Symmetry: C2
Subunit: 213 residues, 2 copies
Amino acid sequence: NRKTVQAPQVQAQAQVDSLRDQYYTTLATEGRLLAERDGLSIVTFSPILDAVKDKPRVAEIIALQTQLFASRRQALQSEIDGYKQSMDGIRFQLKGLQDSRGNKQIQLSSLREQMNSMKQLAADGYLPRNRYLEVQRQFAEVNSSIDETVGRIGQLQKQLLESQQRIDQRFADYQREVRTQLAQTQMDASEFRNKLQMADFDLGNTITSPVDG
Amino acid sequence: NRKTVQAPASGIIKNIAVRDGDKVKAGEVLVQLSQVQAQAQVDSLRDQYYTTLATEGRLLAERDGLSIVTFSPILDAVKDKPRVAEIIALQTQLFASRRQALQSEIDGYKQSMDGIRFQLKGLQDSRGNKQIQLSSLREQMNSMKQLAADGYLPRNRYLEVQRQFAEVNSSIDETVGRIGQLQKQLLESQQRIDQRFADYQREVRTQLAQTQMDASEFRNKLQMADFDLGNTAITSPVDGTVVGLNIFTQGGVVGAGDHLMDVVPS
């Protein structure tokens, strides 16, 4: 017993277009971020974006993401490399301090020996015209020198450990940053998706119940 | 009157250059010592010193954003020494890296801001087009007010175009809200660049200060070490003969406060 048509590409198309680039921007940003979250060498973009490279705004936003990705990766790379050679410089300092410490050790044993031989002569009934106290001083000095060198060493070892925790810190900071931006981007991807389903819905109406009779 | 030469440091005399009945030249060498421990200390301080010199060359360049690091001529003069060459290589490396990381970061921020700009372009275009739609709607609402007043369309769909107008407008301000927020993201990201640049300078200026302190500490220490090694070779004060040998102390340990020879002028 009959049906009645009661509903509501001319301007809604514009709305759809507008939501669409914004969305594409989010897709590009998400490809970049996904690549950065994981440890991928190259960004790989959504087939949504992929299907439509030809559009200049799209080609532009992809280029931008490829660049920004490259810049960031180069920067992290160069930073952590910097940390490692900083550590290498520290290790290089450590080596020299150890050389000194050993050579001081040798001077230390030798002082010790001269003190003993003085004591042995004394024990035999011969006391040296030489002053043993002078040697007690040299020995004591070498000893404290050695302590200085050791303290310096401990300091350096602490520094490499701290710098290592610094590296670990900056990877972690990067991870958190990237995951935050990513979740945010994903939310935007979703609000755009849904808004776009709606705009599409609007454009679908321009219409007719049956099409031809 | 007569003065007698005592013993400066306290170590092992390796050789003597004098014996009784032998006159002086003012400042001749009368004794030596092994110098192996004094030579060692000087060497070790020279090493540490050399390390800070490398570092300092790097920091100065990073402070003045020089394109290439340029090292102290001292370092140049002893480049042949393997640890020296080593540290120069490492410092040059560490420089290359750091300048690189900074560039790459700043590039990232400029490209990200360009991304924000690319977004704003689209948003501005959208807003413009929406302004047009707003205008066309208003003119059509007017024409409808006219028909209504004549009696030809009821006021009931006459209200509809006003609904449309309002929706388009509210859409426009959604878009503007986004624009403003983004304009903020530009100011914010820009200040992030600026702040971290300030941070890099602060770090470098500090670290340089540290290095200078160290350089100073080594410099003055080395000066002292050089006094000691220079002092392992004993010299006469007056000008004339020598009296008072302990004939055979050659090779034997000595103390501070020990006078083992005296020198004559008649």
